[PDB]
Design a protein around this ligand. Structure first.
Ligand SMILES: [Zn+2]
Ligand SMILES: [Zn+2]
Length: 133
């Protein structure tokens, strides 16, 4: 009889990134680093100036693709980090929606807290990258 095994191949978990995998990941990191830098520079200042109208446009425009980008990055990580990274992508989106609502409410204290919480979870996510090790 046929010699091949019919059992599930258990090609186990990689726990380091190959250059391929790292170049592939970089395709998502690029726009995500742009968004992280823009949140630090421009969005911060817009909140500080109580410029609520431009705050909201910033979230919808420059950050409008960030959920999609982070979710694509997350699904590309080592299996070990995929779920945590996905959960963090969803947390950042959540704080940006709470941010947009604070801008609508012209509540600068609430806006600053959601901005900080969005950055804390964004930086948590970024710390899963081979860049932070
Ligand atoms: Zn959060
Ligand atoms: Zn909105």
């Amino acid at each position: 009889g046929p010699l091949g095994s019919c059992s599930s191949p258990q090609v186990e978990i990689p726990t380091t990134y190959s250059p391929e995998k790292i170049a592939q990941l970089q395709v998502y990191v690029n726009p995500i680093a742009v968004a992280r830098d823009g949140m630090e520079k421009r969005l911060q200042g817009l909140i500080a100036d109580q410029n609520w109208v431009d705050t909201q446009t910033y979230i919808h425009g420059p950050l409008g693709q960030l959920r999609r980008d982070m979710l694509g990055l997350a699904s590309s990580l080592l299996p070990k980090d995929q779920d945590k990274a996905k959960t963090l992508a969803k947390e950042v989106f959540g704080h940006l929606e709470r941010l947009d609502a604070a801008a609508k409410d012209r509540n600068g204290s609430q806006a600053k807290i959601q901005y900080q919480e969005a950055l804390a979870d964004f930086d948590s996510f970024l710390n899963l990258l081979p860049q932070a090790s």
